[PDB]
């Protein structure tokens, strides 16, 4: 049987699913770790103990515990990111889509979902892996990992809540793939890990961390990189927030044991309800000196990281999503013209760690002084501030550092605004919306994309799959390599390829070189 | 006799001169102070003691002792600024052009030459006042003042070398106009002081100084304002440089009297020969508490200054002249493309007072990062850096502070490049070159200007004279008033008058608000 597979942990029974009038093999909700419940919560995961019998793998597993977005109840644009399954701390499962018939030893791609390290699910409609596995003949895998406090509460020194366990969770699913993907037709020596946003930061963290390097071949980073300002914190800040979570829940704060034991008796929603109350994203990776030996910046300067090929990029409007959720004067229904009063508080809010001088620098850098009370210019400038600071420049800093040592870099700028996008037009090319093209949703007619969006999705997948199989997106019209001298990249849209150079250099020299120097002195 | 005039200090005999096939009276070399020689060097001017007989006022007087430029020996573009008469410490004289026949009580304009407070003469071909006195029916006066150590050596406390004596010479000449101009056909109640560069900074200093305010009605400032970074120093810096001048000349430094007496024994050229050796322009006005009661900034915020009408502005390329003379990579016979190494060192030199953070700031603010090695963009950026930091932005700050309390502001941007310029094209519309137009040299045919330049000149002159007589450059195509709201100004060129707003706001916010704050905090 094509559906019954035997693995080092037990037998598994997948199901047959239809894909664009053909079919493929799917193994859903396969366990890769021991449920991190009870005294396990907050701890490094442990491998799933082998089972007897046949594991039913014809359905999606639970989604990890996480804050659930209710800003726009029932709206499909927000709702598509929320758990579409029941939440549970018993959530460490992976999904595999295998082409039918089973390939001898084909290319594997492991998907790592985003959600700011506080949310996310492997089971979203946008991460349905059948179209990619099917269309490109790849074995497609989506893992899961604990988010929020459950995955990142960090009490450095403690072994009961060491920090970075959602990351170790990711590493264990990768190890599982390394150990078992072969029984599915996948080639363990050819695995590409790829993710978007918090997941893209994840990929880059596994490129860094010595203990993950050998568990994959190549990496793809979408709108996220390891060095993002919101992707990690110091052991100090991690400890401080862990204690503050305790304080908020009436926990004896005498010792880490005291604290941790209190947190372990609390029901899930109880941690989730107070999660936001500890900020100066609450629980994120910690630069511990273990998963990450030294500072991210020093590892990058020394070349202390996996040297391989990478494919990465950003979307045109990385910041509009967050402006709509956290800044004054933005609305899902209005054009969102921003007055100068709002613009100003909007920058105070986008560079949370900056002083007055720093704020003046940002302000002056994104204000047209001939037309300072223009609402569109202020809206769009705040969008760029958020996107440049949080996603784009940190990524360009990483792309430049890595290329000095890597074995091949491919950079992209995705600027296509889907024709069926349910979000307001002023939001442009939104953070997260290149994903539906990566996963081939445009190939399904009921979804109503245009003929060119299908064409766009098809070359995006073929670039991705080809890159996964060979280290180069092109089969022997060319996407050029990104070199520290030339710095080329392509646009990704329906129109014909255009090669450009130095993606957002001006603004990124400001964020990467200049602003940090300014905050240092002051 | 029309040429024989009797004044409060003695009879004076002028001469009839030709002007565009006609004639007018000229009274050249009239003494307004006692020769500041011997024990008088560095002291405040003393009024000229009355004489008997008739003073011969038919020729130009001596030029004050100053550094002479011979970077381009024989070259007309640099020599037109050098002394065209013998140099002597006996140089406190003034010149008057009176329309023929003699007006009953017409508008008076007093020219104050520039030259960075270390040079300048009233007798230059470009300041010939006959064309303007003639064409606009005004009585035109050019005064003189001591420059270099002779006029600005400051040892505050001392009364032998109090500093600011060159400003007081200007004030003595203004006082003399007040008391005598009526006998020449001039209206002492309708005098406009006007000058360029250091002379424009001078006019502004007389607007601030309580003791000069009543000696004129209105003011015109061309390419300079009181608050320019190179236009004044503190008493400490003044003293520091005074002592350092003595040191280079082996002087007793035990006390000011010892020093001054030594400084008074050295011949003129000896002081000049070591004038530059004291810079961390050497001797300029001092914020002494007397000529200027408080800081220039505090006087401008409190409105502690003469309230009247002002007409002022800048040229398109204020900085090319100083780049030709002091920066690496510039030449008069080359297109002067600037390497990246030279651009760097060039900003270091342009903003002498800034730390490394300030320098990075300036560099970033003026570098196109997608074409940083373009030689021409580097030349032009350095040009704008010098021009914006030393002339334009200081002036815009002045303009905005003054309009808050003034009684009428008329702003201009002169961007016409003379058809007959002997300086290279890359230098554009140079510092000082709008003067030939203000003085009507485009009206003399052998000078080989075009006819739309003769026309430009005529309207500039008419605007200047009309403004001098009424406080408005337009006789009832209009030059709008500059208001703190609309911030309107006009271009001054051969094409039809265009009205713009916010002259170089973008860069000026950087120079006037952001960089000062950056530096104050670091
Ligand atoms: C910085 O990354 C994020 C922080 C918060 C959120 C998202 C993020 O990435 C977005 C797109 C996708 O990665 C998943 C979640 C996001 C969209 C859904 N919500 C509600 C919140
Ligand atoms: C900042 O002002 C100046 C500093 C130095 C010089 C000049 C300045 O203004 C220029 C134009 C005019 O005002 C007189 C002298 C200048 C041109 C001639 N030389 C050689 C030097
Ligand atoms: C696996 O569980 C699903 C959920 O109800 C069910 O549809 C399927 O038949 C099960 N497989 C078997 C035969 O156990
Ligand atoms: C990748 O590595 C091989 C040697 O291991 C090298 O020859 C090749 O040039 C590298 N490719 C790139 C694009 O750096
Ligand atoms: C005035 O001085 C000039 C120049 O020295 C001389 O030529 C002229 O004749 C003098 N006029 C009188 C009347 O002294
Ligand atoms: C100048 O001041 C007078 C008051 O003395 C006032 O009537 C006039 O409107 C003012 N003009 C301007 C342009 O400020």
Curated annotation (Swiss-Prot), chains A, B:
InterPro entries: AB_hydrolase_fold, AChE-related_enzymes, Acylcholinesterase_fish/snake, CarbesteraseB, Carboxylesterase_B_AS, Carboxylesterase_B_CS, Cholinesterase
Keywords assigned by UniProt, alphabetized: Cell membrane, Disulfide bond, Glycoprotein, GPI-anchor, Hydrolase, Lipoprotein, Membrane, Neurotransmitter degradation, Serine esterase, Signal, Synapse
Tissue: Found in the synapses and to a lower extent in extrajunctional areas of muscle and nerve, and on erythrocyte membranes.
GO molecular function, one term: acetylcholinesterase activity
Catalytic residues in the record: 197, 318, 431
Catalytic activity: acetylcholine + H2O = choline + acetate + H(+)
Assigned EC number: 3.1.1.7
S-S pairs: 64-91, 251-262, 393-508
Inhibition and activation profile: Inhibited by substrate concentrations above 0.5 mM.
Biological processes, Gene Ontology terms: acetylcholine catabolic process in synaptic cleft; choline metabolic process
Domain of life per record: Eukaryota
Post-translational modification: An interchain disulfide bond is present in what becomes position 593 of the T isoform.
Gene3D superfamilies, per the entry: alpha/beta hydrolase (3.40.50.1820)
Annotated glycan sites: 56, 407, 448, 520
Any Gene Ontology CC annotation: extracellular space
Impact after mutating residue 416 to Q: Almost no loss of activity
SUPFAM superfamilies given in the database record: alpha/beta-Hydrolases
Effect the entry attributes to changing residue 431 to Q: Loss of activity
A Pfam family recorded for this sequence: COesterase
Quaternary data: Isoform H form is a homodimer; the asymmetric form is a disulfide-bonded oligomer composed of a collagenic subunit (Q) and a variable number of T catalytic subunits.
Function field: Terminates signal transduction at the neuromuscular junction by rapid hydrolysis of the acetylcholine released into the synaptic cleft. May be involved in cell-cell interactions.
Family according to the record: Belongs to the type-B carboxylesterase/lipase family.
Name of the protein in its database record: Acetylcholinesterase
Taxonomic source organism: Tetronarce californica (Pacific electric ray)
């Amino acid at each position: 049987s094509e559906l019954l597979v035997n693995t080092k942990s037990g037998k598994v029974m997948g199901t047959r699913v239809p894909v664009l009038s053909s079919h493929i093999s799917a193994f859903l909700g396969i366990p890769f770790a021991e449920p991190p419940v009870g005294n396990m919560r907050f701890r490094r995961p442990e491998p799933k103990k082998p089972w007897s019998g046949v594991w039913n793998a014809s359905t999606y597993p639970n989604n990890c515990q996480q804050y659930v977005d209710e800003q726009f109840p029932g709206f499909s644009g927000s709702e598509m990111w929320n758990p579409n399954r029941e939440m549970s701390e018993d959530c460490l499962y992976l999904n595999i889509w295998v082409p039918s018939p089973r390939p001898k030893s084909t290319t594997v791609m492991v998907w790592i979902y985003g959600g700011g390290f506080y949310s996310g699910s492997s089971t979203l409609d946008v991460y349905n892996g059948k179209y990619l596995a099917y269309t490109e003949e790849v074995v497609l895998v989506s893992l899961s990992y604990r988010v929020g406090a459950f995955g990142f509460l960090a009490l450095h020194g403690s072994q009961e809540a060491p920090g970075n366990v959602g990351l170790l969770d990711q590493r264990m699913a990768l190890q599982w793939v390394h150990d078992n993907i072969q029984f599915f037709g996948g080639d363990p020596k050819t695995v590409t890990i790829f993710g978007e946003s918090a997941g893209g930061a994840s990929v880059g963290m596994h490129i860094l961390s010595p203990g993950s390097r050998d568990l994959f071949r190549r990496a793809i980073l979408q709108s996220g990189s390891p060095n993002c300002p919101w992707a990690s914190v110091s052991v100090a800040e991690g400890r401080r927030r862990a204690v503050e979570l305790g304080r908020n829940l009436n926990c004896n704060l005498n010792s880490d044991e005291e604290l941790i034991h209190c947190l372990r008796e609390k029901k899930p929603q109880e941690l989730i309800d107070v999660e936001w109350n500890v900020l100066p994203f609450s629980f994120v990776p910690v630069i511990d000196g273990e998963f990450f030996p030294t500072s991210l910046e020093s590892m990058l300067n020394s070349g202390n990281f996996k040297k391989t090929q990478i494919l990465l990029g950003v979307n045109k409007d990385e910041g509009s999503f967050f402006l709509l959720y956290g800044a004054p004067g933005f609305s899902k229904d209005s054009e969102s013209k921003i007055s100068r009063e709002d613009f100003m508080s909007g920058v105070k809010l986008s560079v949370p760690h900056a002083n007055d001088l720093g704020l003046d620098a940002v302000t002056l850098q994104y204000t047209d002084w001939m037309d300072d009370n223009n609402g569109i210019k202020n809206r769009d400038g705040l969008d760029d501030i958020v996107g440049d600071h949080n996603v784009i420049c940190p990524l360009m800093h990483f792309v430049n550092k890595y290329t000095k040592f890597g074995n091949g870099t491919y950079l992209y700028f995705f600027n296509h605004r889907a024709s069926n996008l349910v979000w307001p037009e002023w939001m442009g090319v939104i953070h997260g919306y290149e994903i539906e093209f990566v996963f081939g949703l445009p190939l399904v007619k009921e979804l109503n994309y245009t003929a060119e969006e299908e064409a766009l999705s098809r070359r995006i997948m073929h670039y991705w799959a080809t890159f996964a199989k060979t280290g180069n997106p092109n089969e022997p019209s060319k996407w050029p390599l990104f070199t520290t001298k030339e710095q080329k990249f392509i646009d990704l849209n329906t129109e014909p390829m255009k090669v450009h150079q130095r993606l957002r250099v001006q603004m990124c020299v400001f964020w990467n070189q200049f602003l940090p120097k300014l905050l240092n002195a002051t």
